[PDB]
Amino acid sequence: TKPIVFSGAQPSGELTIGNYMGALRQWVNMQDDYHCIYCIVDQHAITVRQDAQKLRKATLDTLALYLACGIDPEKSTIFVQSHVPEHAQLGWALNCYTYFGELSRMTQFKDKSARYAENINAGLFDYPVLMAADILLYQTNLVPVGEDQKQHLELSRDIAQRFNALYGEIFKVPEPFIPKSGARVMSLLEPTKKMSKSDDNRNNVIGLLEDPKSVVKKIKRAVTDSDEPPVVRYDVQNKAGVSNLLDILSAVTGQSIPELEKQFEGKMYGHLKGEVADAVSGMLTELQERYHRFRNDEAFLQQVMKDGAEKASAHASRTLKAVYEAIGFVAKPH
Amino acid sequence: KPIVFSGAQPSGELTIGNYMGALRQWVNMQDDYHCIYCIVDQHAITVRQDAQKLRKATLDTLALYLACGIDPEKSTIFVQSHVPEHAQLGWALNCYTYFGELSRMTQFKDKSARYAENINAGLFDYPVLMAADILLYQTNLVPVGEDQKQHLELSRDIAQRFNALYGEIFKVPEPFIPKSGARVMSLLEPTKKMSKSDDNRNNVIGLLEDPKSVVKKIKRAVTDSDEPPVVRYDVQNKAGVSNLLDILSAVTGQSIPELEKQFEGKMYGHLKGEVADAVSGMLTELQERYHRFRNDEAFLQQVMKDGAEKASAHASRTLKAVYEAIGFVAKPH
Ligand SMILES: Nc1ncnc2c1ncn2[C@@H]1O[C@H](COP(=O)(O)OC(=O)[C@@H](N)Cc2c[nH]c3ccccc23)[C@@H](O)[C@H]1O
Ligand SMILES: C[C@H]1c2c[nH]c3cccc(c23)S[C@H]1C(=O)O
Incomplete structure (x- = not known):
């Protein structure tokens, strides 16, 4: 079986050329060389309060943008994060193997706190644990992201190693995959600032x-x-x-x-x-x-979502079952 | 008929004080209320412990509750991790809980008992999962001791805050006020009540x-x-x-x-x-x-299977409403 690639993007705001250059370009290019799984992380998106109607529409927008970029549902697994409960389940269990300091030193948490000072919620704090869960559920070897995700990615290697050191080789230690060019696309009028999908000008x-x-x-x-x-x-x-x-x-x-x-x-x-x-x-x-062409065919979008979640759940449920034995839960009868 | 929810820690060494107070009281009221008992294994792992011991104690707790009179035909008894909806609503409710609300928790500051950056995030986020445990089931009533009062109030705040944005999705739970009546004091410290959590x-x-x-x-x-x-x-x-x-x-x-x-x-x-x-x-x-209960491994499996299935029909109903209100694309069936 090929090594496994996993990565995610938020269905929030309008994706930029920074998103393309830091992540999406690499996602398309890896689809033949590795076994790629790509996710729309709707559960991460709501750590920043969103209009409910926009969020549902943005989820379909992101999926059709994946397809327009060349992500192929016959080569890649594409799904919506909340359609796979095992992300939430593993996210809870990994909370118990994560230190508070690790989360409170996160650059993204500090930046988002300043920007969203009326909504400094605990999802915003817990964000890296769920992201670690999204990654370790799939036995992932490579995570193609931009440079701003590198601290998060390094926490998930730490969590994986911490858990493995206790219970055996349950997780793979993932490795970052960050392009040497276009890892941090800069702002057009302020090239010292990264191009943000949250900019007010x-x-x-x-x-x-x-x-x-x-x-x-x-x-x-x-x-x-x-x-x-x-x-x-x-x-x-x-x-x-x-x-x-x-x-x-x-x-x-x-x-x-x-x-x-x-x-x-x-x-x-x-x-x-x-x-x-x-x-x-x-x-x-x-x-x-x-x-x-992709966005206006919602019944095609629904079909990709269903097939993807089913493909993802097969893999995630294998890992989650192994985590649950590792840690001591009684298994659910079937 | 009101819904009542209680979490049972699968590590509580239960005393006669528990049994002649709260448990006897509720065993006698399973026909007056729709009672729900949840063995909180996902809560347990916030304190590191032996995997085999945690598995055994989860089954001990279940057999002990059945021994005390909890009837699985009348009430719903299940293991928390057997119902994924707890973790799911637990994550979603994180997005509506202020970071400060969690840091101002006395139980977090007490169970901290060490320096931050050595305290795991499960210990910090513990109250949001409790809130999720309660709200999934449209709970009207929660029996809580004094140490759980702050947690219940947070649950009531989250329910109301969520309802104010999205509609009456959650029932605001209430404390269960009346006390059992039985008085059981500590054997060497007869001024303070006998507690399952005394280190003596x-x-x-x-x-x-x-x-x-x-x-x-x-x-x-x-x-x-x-x-x-x-x-x-x-x-x-x-x-x-x-x-x-x-x-x-x-x-x-x-x-x-x-x-x-x-x-x-x-x-x-x-x-x-x-x-x-x-x-x-x-x-x-x-x-x-x-x-009798503890050695019948098939009986315990049947109770866990029935309990979790009963819990899931209620839990999934609420979760589907939460996700629709939040604005997620619903899962294709
Ligand atoms: N100016 C820029 N230049 C270059 N790359 C950039 C630029 N802006 C953004 N990126 C990259 O785009 C991806 C999408 O970011 P999101 O905010 O959607 O998404 C994020 O920032 C993740 N937390 C989502 C996520 C959740 N779970 C995961 C698991 C694996 C990988 C990713 C995830 C990211 O790779 C980001 O690094
Ligand atoms: C067992 C714990 C727990 C988890 N979920 C719930 C829901 C309601 C009441 C309680 C709980 S009581 C609480 C405690 O710490 O006593």
Whole structure:
């Protein structure tokens, strides 16, 4: 059997080119090489209060965006997290193998606390435990995520090792899979800030479903450096704006950074932003065409969801049963 | 007919105080209420312990409750982890519980008993799961002791806060106010009540102790320096003999005035010998039922299977409403 890939995305907010470049691109590319399981984490999404109607619609939006990106339900398991109760069950049990300090030192918890100071709920605190549960349920070897999930991923390796040290090889120790380029896509007008699916000025964000014409406008106004003379060179430290555009172009065309640096020799930033805008506008145009064919067929969306949850429950229930014996529960009679 | 919910810790070494107080009270009311008994194994693992012991004690608790008179035809008795809806609603209710509500918990600060970053998240999140245990079943009434009062109030707050956003999904549970009546005090500390959780096991008589062991603890029971020895009820100066008369009367039904006249001209040796004899007689009938249930592994399986199925039909109904209200896509059937 192949090694197992698992990853998740929240059906909340509008997914960005950062989501694509940090995770989704790798998800598509791994579907043949490994046994991939991809999840829409609706139980994580509600740690930030959401309108109920939007959340149900956003769940179908995310699923159709997966399919438009090229996730194939005949190659990959795709499901909605809450359709598989074993995520909640293992999430509870792993709470007991997680220290309070580990959760209270989490960068994402601190950032979300500041941003959502009226709703600092315990799900927001417990978030990494459920995410560890989503991963360890499937005997996962690889987790493709962006760089902002690395602390969370390292906790789930710790929890896996802690549990294994007590009860034997019940879990696999997962390994992160974070791309060397486009792991932290930066904001267009503030290239020191990661591009956030929660930004309150949309001029920083390229949405995957946003109007391509509005997207080209944002990329043309991307903030570049004041190097004299201007030079299209890759350097994340002192040329943040330029390098972020190079990453974004690379993710659209498939050309390497050094091939792109050669192609832009003797070229200035206005030509660079225009090439990025044309490349990105083209991919979003094709992406949104596939998106709508999938999104408007809800009975197809329902079929993918059902088949995926059934495929996922088979695997999760094997692990959860082994956890429950490890720890001492009486097994439920059948 | 009101729904009543109680969690049974599958690690409680239950005493005669539990049995003649709360348990006797509820065994006699299974037809007046729709009672639900949940052995909380998912709560237990918040304190690290031996896996085999936890498995055995879960079955001991079940057989002990059946021995005390819990009728699985009348009431619902089940094991928490056999109903996934507890963990599911437990996670969802996390998203509606303030971090501060959980950190201001005295039970969390007490059961902490160490430094944070050495206290597991199960100990921190414990109250939300209790809230989930209660609300899944549309519970009207919860019997709680003083140490569980703060937990129940959080449950009531969560229910109301959830209802205010989504509609009447949850029933707001109430405490069950009236007390059992039976008074059972600690054997060496006759001012404080006998508790299942005392680390001094000589203060208690457990439900499975043999008569030779019952005598040892009864004979060492604190009494008073009153000359001459008089067997008379008075809680301020005869608190010790007062406990023994209370325990005896709890066991036999005899009134305190009838007991006082029964022990007119008797000394403290006859009172303790009569207390131990009466306690051991009650415990002998209790234990023979316990061993009958506990060794019938097929009977226990059938009770767990029936209980969990009964619990799931109620639990899933509530959970489906919760998820629809929250806005999840419902699971394709
Ligand atoms: N600017 C950016 N540049 C590069 N990558 C980025 C950028 N912004 C976001 N990402 C990545 O996109 C993925 C989706 O993030 P979510 O917030 O939906 O989702 C999250 O942040 C997870 N907690 C969801 C989750 C729950 N359980 C899991 C188990 C495995 C993996 C993931 C999960 C993520 O990989 C994130 O790193
Ligand atoms: C057993 C524990 C428990 C778990 N779920 C519930 C629900 C109601 C009452 C209680 C509980 S009582 C409580 C305790 O700590 O006494």
